[PDB]
Amino acid sequence: LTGTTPAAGGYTTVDNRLQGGHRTGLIAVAFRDALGTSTNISPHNANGSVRWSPLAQDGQLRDDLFAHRLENGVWVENTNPNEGWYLAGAFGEGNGPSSRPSIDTDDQMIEQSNWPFESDITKQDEPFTFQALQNLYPAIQRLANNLPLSDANGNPLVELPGEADGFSQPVDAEKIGRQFLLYGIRKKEGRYLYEVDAYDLAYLNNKGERKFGKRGTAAELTFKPEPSGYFMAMVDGEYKPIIKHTFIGGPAWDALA
Amino acid sequence: LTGTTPAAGGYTTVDNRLQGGHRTGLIAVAFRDALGTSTNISPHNANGSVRWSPLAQDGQLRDDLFAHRLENGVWVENTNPNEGWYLAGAFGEGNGPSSRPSIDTDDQMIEQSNWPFESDITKQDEPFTFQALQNLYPAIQRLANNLPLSDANGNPLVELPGEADGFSQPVDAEKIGRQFLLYGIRKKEGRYLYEVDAYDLAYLNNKGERKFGKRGTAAELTFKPEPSGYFMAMVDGEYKPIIKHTFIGGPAWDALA
Amino acid sequence: DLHDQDAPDEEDFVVCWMQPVMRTAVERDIDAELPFCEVTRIDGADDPEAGTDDPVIQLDFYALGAEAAKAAAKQGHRRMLFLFRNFPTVTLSDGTLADLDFGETLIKPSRMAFEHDQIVRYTARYQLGTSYVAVP
Amino acid sequence: DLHDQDAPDEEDFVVCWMQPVMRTAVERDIDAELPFCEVTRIDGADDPEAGTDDPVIQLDFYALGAEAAKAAAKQGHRRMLFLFRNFPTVTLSDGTLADLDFGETLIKPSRMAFEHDQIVRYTARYQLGTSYVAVP
Amino acid sequence: DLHDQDAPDEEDFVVCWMQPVMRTAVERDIDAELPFCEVTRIDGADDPEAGTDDPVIQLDFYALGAEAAKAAAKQGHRRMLFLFRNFPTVTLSDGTLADLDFGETLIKPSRMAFEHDQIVRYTARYQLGTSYVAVP
Amino acid sequence: DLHDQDAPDEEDFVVCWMQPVMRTAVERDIDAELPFCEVTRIDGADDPEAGTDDPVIQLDFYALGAEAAKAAAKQGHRRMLFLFRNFPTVTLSDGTLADLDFGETLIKPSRMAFEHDQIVRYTARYQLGTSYVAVP
Amino acid sequence: DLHDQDAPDEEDFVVCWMQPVMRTAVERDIDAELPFCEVTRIDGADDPEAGTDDPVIQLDFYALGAEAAKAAAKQGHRRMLFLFRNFPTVTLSDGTLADLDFGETLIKPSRMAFEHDQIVRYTARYQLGTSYVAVP
Amino acid sequence: DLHDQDAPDEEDFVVCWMQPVMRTAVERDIDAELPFCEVTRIDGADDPEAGTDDPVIQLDFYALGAEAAKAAAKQGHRRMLFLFRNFPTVTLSDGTLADLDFGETLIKPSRMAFEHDQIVRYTARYQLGTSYVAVP
């Protein structure tokens, strides 16, 4: 039988530390081919042990992730062991990794009552889009023209920049499965907070308008994910398939508690 | 079990040298008729040897490409041997060679799961558009009115400027196949980088609004490509038909490695 | 009683960041060495609910002769670009650690008038993005 | 005969709110202590039908030296943020109780010119939201 | 430590390009020959992520009499148009090679006031487009 | 020959309305009592076809000391609000009866500079709506 | 050889129209009677192809005392409204007949500063619409 | 080496066109006859790729007395309208033949202040459209 003030009661409690990557200056996206078992990126095992994670044990990011490196202005292939991932370059201002889900519902209508009797989710999708400026990169060119980055054996086929000649778009193409990781890096008080999204499979959905000129724009690629069957995780301690997983971690995140 | 910093790890590696022709001041488009075997522009042979390329062996551009030349303010036909190509003139500001692909997909829906079961590419196209200001050029006038630039024997029919009288648009016309090359020339540190697109066949799709007056605008032509059957290339070392090929080269490009 | 959160001091941040490469202070005495950067704030906005702060910072470069002034301006712009790109940690005078959210260049260094006829003044303008840290 | 409703006096509101933390008045005499805030109104609009009032308030901080002026400006901004967030009740000189509807920061404290060469002046600008109370 | 890329110096670029046709410098001494161009920068913006730079350059022409001034302005405009069209390579004072991305004319040469009553000053304004080259 | 319709005189309207509560005139002599309002028009537009008139009126309040000036400004604003709300009939100097169509407050009273160092001047701005009455 | 069509002179039109009701001229000598209107043009545009002309005309009223000035301004505004409404024919000094296409009031008479401390100046602004008549 | 195309000189064009009807020059000496037009350029833009040029030209008319000045302004405007309509060919001082693409009147002649108390100055502004001819 006692009512506290709004401030004391906690009704106006806020904390900017929980804010996501909707305001940051460090973004990056990496991609590769999808070969089923060889490219499995599921985070957990059947028992619940950690299977795979972009974050290292120490809490930092991994370094063996990429396949190509830039050193002293020279594009040289990495000699150290690596999983093999390719990194997109710059992004035009006002355009970045964004997702635009669309949801559809069906309502049952009964003559008895005006209010809908029940509703259900009929169709769902979650496509994403990014704009690349370094369109002359071999990886991006292959991505835009629907070509495999790796062969059947899994050996890499992407060439170093300034090595291959003009590409080509085949008359008849086939769906290619690709993997994507979206990175959002934010630092506060000398501590890193990481937000990384995972997409086991994704197809090429739509391209974008591009124009030559003094103030021309580059194309904006669009992808849609689709359930593959090799993506498993501890959802509430229950082995079952999913479509997307998000990794959260870092020294900043652990300091919240 | 070690995580490197984002800067050292290479997660923020960029290079403007890989940027395409989305910011440049040198653009040009050339066109001619398509006569099958006589106008074949396929880049490679069956074995894989270089068949045709707009770039010379030395790495510079070719000079025998064009049919008409302008010298001392006089339009004179070229006497040296040439393949025969016509060059469009100026382009209005904010308008240039641009492509606007449109992609359509069909999704299979199963009562078992809300997520789409599978998707496939139903229809695809890649039309382009350019705006010409020198609309009194005989080549452009013939292009707009759907007339053949060359006869059955292949001999040229385009007249020199200020020679022919008023043209005419026939009551009944027929589809004419045309070839197109889009040029993007960018130079850095006294080195040239070339980006040229190739289109074996293209038809006239749509015209644009044009108005007389003090501040009137010129028409903007639109073309769509279509598989001809004479366009072949080494796509991953596999002779198979394609619809578009891009040539990349130059001293600047080779210096990347 | 005051609020418990506030953004780090922008002028102190910029001074402590530029100081390792060149002499910098909020105000220049009547006599000092030529290499010199001056910091100022012109505009900003603070939003307590969202934890958002958008300050605007001005850098003035003074040096003897046009050549030295231009060289100092180039060095300062390169240092600012390094700060914008690599997001390093900066220790203030108070010892606190502060960071940035982003950065953007509004006016690249240009020439402005000055009373002294030997010292040449160059001016550049920058925009910053900062958050709220807990007050100690 | 006059109307029966009017918004509370904005200057008196701000003075009675800032006074506990630092000396403040609408006008500064020729001599006083350094810590000092000055209040002013620049713009506003009143709508009798909807009971809506949107005043704009300016705070000027005077102190000896750049350091003290910046510290005073920071303290004043923190006090204003506390007022904006917690919505406290303020007792005016007349004894009436007045409250706010919202608040927003337009210009975070910056440096402005002043005639005196020792006192440094900092200026901040704020926007308020107020309603109509019955005239007693 | 500074960043590793920067655009070529715009003033040095323009001076080294216009010098073969007419005397040009960033500043004019009290006495010199009439034919003379002066270079300046008024505005710009740099974007490290995209490698984009948009400087604005001003050219001032001084000559004795209206006729000579107009002739010099015409010659300078023609030289600038040649530079915009043919995209030539320019060697700076440092020996580095630099190029342009595009160019555009904002204000065609017009007449402006000047203190000297014999020298006539003409002013033109141009916009440039430049990229980032590696720092040597 | 002149037209047969015209709107009532706005200055005379405002003077005859404010006069019962406080001394008011279009111009202030060199000496008078402190309580004082001054009326002026800055802008307007007349449309004969639609019978529409949108004048803009300014009120200046002079009083000795800040306190008295603020009190006078508050009283004047309350009187104007009463006029806006209740739409009363006002008898001019000529004896004609005139009314309003609407009213709106653009600038709530604020402080402005004045030459005299004891008299404090407050300024408020209002907008009116008037129609056309037959000329007698 | 000159063109064969031109709009009627706007200043002469307005002077010959206002003259029957009050003394008016393009310029006022050092001494004259108080009732006085002054005409001027500030802006316009002519289109030979469409026969369209949109001049802007200013009327200044001078009279001794505020009362007389306001009365003169009211009379002038009424005369202008009559002209706008009834579209009468006006005979110029040259004897030509000229007419209007439309009219609109931009600024209703307001008070402006003047050097003389007894003469009060009122200013009004109007817009006109005129066509092209054949040159005789 | 310079470019090979340039638009005809606008000032020389206008001077050689207006000269047959009235004395005109880019600059007026301390003493001359009253009838007089002065030409100037205020703004423009050149596009080498499209061959487009949009200069802005100003004409100032000086004459003794208001009447003569207005008559000269009317004559000059009629001459300009004739030029805009009939598109005649004009021979420059160099002997080259030049033409126009279009024309438009921005400000019809109005009155401006001048130091001399007997000479009355009228000002008109025009816009032109020109192309590129080959340099001989």
DSSP bridge pairs for A192: A187
Question: Using the beta-carbon criterion (under 8 Å), do F41 and G84 form an inter-chain contact?
Answer: no
Whether C9 contacts D109, CB under 8 Å: no
Resolution in A: 3.8
Phi-psi region of B59 (alpha: psi -120 to 50; beta: other; left: phi over 0): left
* Closest Cβ opposite residue A26 in set B12, B113, B116: B12
Q: Which residue numbers of A have CB closer than 8 Å to D's CBs?
A: 7, 12
Q: How far apart are CA D68 and CA B108, in angstroms?
A: 70
Handedness of CA B89, B94, B95, B96 (dihedral sign): positive
How far apart, in whole angstroms, are the C-alpha atoms of residue A96 and residue C71? 35
- Breaks in chain D after (C-N > 2.5 angstroms): none
Experimental approach:
cryo-EM
DSSP β-ladder status, B191-206 and B220-225: antiparallel
For residue F133, the cross-strand partners are: F6
Rounded CA-CA distance E130/B23 in Å is: 10
- Residue F51 zone, left/alpha/beta (φ > 0; ψ -120 to 50; rest): left
Structure tokens given for B242: 């394609």
CB atoms near residue H21 (< 10 Å): 17
Cβ–Cβ < 8 Å for A202, A116? no
Residue H56 · residue H44 · CB < 8 Å: yes
B78-to-A132, B65, B74 alpha-carbon distances in Å: 42, 10, 12
Kind of pairing between the strands at C36-43 and C24-25: parallel
Q: Closest residue of H to B213, CA-based?
A: H102
Q: Which residue in chain E is spatially nearest to A133 when comparing CA positions?
A: E50
Contact C8, C98 (CB under 8 A): yes
3-class DSSP assignment, residue A215: coil
Amino acid at A219: A
Chains that touch E (3 or more CB pairs under 8 A): A, B, C, H
In terms of Cβ atoms closer than 10 Å to its own Cβ (0-12, 13-18, 19+), residue E80 is buried
CB contact under 8 A, E131 and B189: no
CB under 8 Å to F100, separation ≥6 — which residues?
A: F83, F84, F87, F128, F129, F130
Give E111 to chain B, closest Cα distance, Å. Answer: 28
A184 vs chain D: nearest CA distance in angstroms? 29
Of A247, A201, A245, A222, the C-alpha closest to A98 is: A222
C97 vs A24, A25, A190: nearest CB: A190
Nearest to D50 by CA among D129, D105, D104: D129
Residue with tokens 């939201």: D129
Evaluate whether E122 touches E61 at the Cβ level (below 8 Å).
yes
Q: What are phi and psi of F84, to 5 degrees?
A: -65, -35
Distance CA F45, CA F4 (A): 18
Do residue F108 and residue D27 have CB atoms under 8 angstroms apart? no
Do E and F make contact via 3 or more CB pairs under 8 A? The reply is no
User: In chain B, which residues have their Cβ closer than 8 Å to the Cβ of E102?
Assistant: 23-25
Residue pair A194/A184 in contact (Cβ under 8 Å)? The answer is yes
Cβ-based burial of B193 (10 A; exposed 0-12, middle 13-18, buried ≥19) = buried
Q: How far is A1 from chain E (nearest CA, A)?
A: 60
Task: Considering only the beta carbons, identify the residue of G81, G108, G110 that sits closest to F3.
Answer: G81
The answer to whether the Cβ–Cβ distance between H47 and B91 falls below 8 Å is no
Residues with Cβ < 8 Å from B159, sequence gap 6 or more? Answer: B138
Return d(Cα C101, Cα C53) in angstroms, integer.
10
Tokens read off for F23:
């001394």
What does the DSSP 8-state code read for residue F9? Answer: P
Among chain B, residues having any CB pair with chain H shorter than 8 Å are 73, 90-93, 133, 214
Interface test with A, best of D87, D89, D99 (most A CBs within 10 A): D87
Whether chain G has a CB inside 8 Å of the CB on H21: the answer is yes
* DSSP state at residue H113: -
**CA H124 → CA C50, G68, H11, distances in Å?**
55, 36, 15
C-alpha D3/C-alpha F86 separation (Å) is 10
Got the DSSP string for A125-193?
A: E--EEEE-S-TTSHHHHHHHTT--SB-TT--B-PPPTTTS---EEESS-----EEEEEEEEEEETTEEE
Name residue C83's amino acid: L
CA B205 to chain CA centroid, Å, is 15
Strands F24-25 and F36-43: parallel
Residues of C in contact with D118 (CB under 8 A): none
The pair of structure tokens assigned to F29 is 């002599």
Provide the CA A150 distance to its chain's centre, in angstroms: 20
Q: How far is CA C127 from each of CA A190, C43, E9, E85, G18, rounded to the nearest angstrom? A: 21, 10, 23, 35, 59
Query: Looking up tokens 């490290």, which residue turns up?
Result: E48
Distance CA A1, CA B61 (A): 88
Cβ-based interface (< 8 Å): residues of A facing E: 73, 90-93, 133, 214
CB nearest B24 (choices: E89, E97, E101)? E101
Residue C117: count other Cβ atoms within 10 Å of its Cβ.
6
Q: Write the CA distances from C112 to A16, A198, A230, E53, integer angstroms.
A: 40, 51, 64, 20
Interchain CB distance below 8 Å, A25 and C51:
no
Facing B18 at nearest CB: one of A63, A134, A226: A134
Residue of D22, D81, D105 to mutate, interface with C, max C Cβ within 10 Å: D81
G108 with F48: Cβ contact below 8 A: no
The torsion defined by the Cα of B208, B90, B227 and B206, in degrees rounded to 10, comes to: 0
As a residue count, chain A comes to: 257
Q: Which long-range contacts (CB under 8 A, 24 or more apart) does C78-81 make?
A: C78/E2, C78/E3, C78/E6, C78/E135, C79/C17, C79/C18, C79/C21, C79/E2, C79/E3, C80/C105, C80/C124, C80/C126, C81/C105, C81/E3, C81/E6, C81/E46, C81/E48
CA distance G130 to A191: 73
Report which residue type is found at H29: D
Cα D121 versus chain centre, distance: 16
CB within 8 Å: G27 and H66: yes
Categorise residue B94: left if φ over 0, alpha if ψ from -120 to 50, beta otherwise.
left
Count the Cβ atoms, other than its own, within 10 Å of residue B139.
22
b/e map of G127-136 (b: 16 or more CB within 10 Å)?
ebebebeeee
- What is the rounded distance in angstroms from the CA atom of residue D38 to the CA atom of residue F118? 19
Q: Is E112 on the interface with C (CB under 8 A)?
A: no
Cα–Cα distance for residue pair D58/D107, rounded to 1 Å: 9
Neighbours of A105 (CB within 10 A): 11
Nearest-angstrom CA–CA distance, A253 and D82: 27
Taking contacts as CB-CB distances below 8 angstroms, the residues of chain A near C100 are: 25
Cα–Cα dist F50/B46, whole Å: 84
| CA distance, residue E121 to nearest chain H CA (Å) | 13
Q: What is the DSSP string of A226-244?
A: ---S--EEESSS-EEE-S-
Partners of B148 in beta bridges: none
State how far the Cα of F95 lies from the Cα of F100, in Å rounded to an integer: 16
Pairwise CA distance, residues G132 & G122, whole Å: 32
d(CA E39, CA E128): 13
Interface test with D, best of F22, F64, F67, F78 (most D CBs within 10 A): F78
Amino acid of residue D16: C
Q: Do chains E and C touch (3 or more CB pairs under 8 A)?
A: yes
Looking at H19-105, list the stretches that DSSP marks H as alpha helix, in order from N- to C-terminal side: 65-86
Residues 6+ apart with CB under 8 A from B57: none
Q: Number of helices (H) and strands (E) in chain E: give both, helices first.
A: 2, 11
DSSP string, chain B: ---B-HHHHTTT---GGG--TTS-SEEEEEEEE--GGGG---SB-SSS-B---SB-TTSSB-STT-SEEEETTEEEE--S-----EE-----TT--SEE--EEEEEEE--TT-SS-SEEEEEEEE--EEEE-S-TTSHHHHHHHTT--SB-TT--B-PPPTTTS------SS-----EEEEEEEEEEETTEEEEEEEEEEEEEEEE------STT----EEEEEE---S--EEESSS-EEEEEEEEEEE-HHHHTT-
Within 10 Å of residue A58's Cβ, how many Cβ atoms? 11
Nearest to H85 among G3, G53, G55 (CB): G3
Cβ-Cβ contacts under 8 Å for F27 (sequence gap 6 or more): F38, G66
State yes or no: chains G and D have 3 or more CB pairs below 8 A: no
Contact list in D for residue F64 (CB cut-off 8 A) is none
Please name the member of A90, A133, A214 whose beta carbon is closest to the beta carbon of E102: A214
For residue B249, CA distances in Å to A138, B47, E68 come to 13, 22, 47
Q: How far is D76 from chain F (nearest CA, A)?
A: 22
Distance in Å, alpha carbon of A206 to nearest chain C alpha carbon: 31
Residues with Cβ within 8 Å of A67's Cβ and at least 6 positions away in sequence, in order, are A77, A78, A82, A84, A85, A86, A156, A158
Of D27, D45, D48, the CB nearest to F85: D48
Name the phi and psi angles at C81, rounded to 5: -65, -40
Count helices and strands in chain A by DSSP H and E runs: 3, 16
CA A95 to chain centre: 15
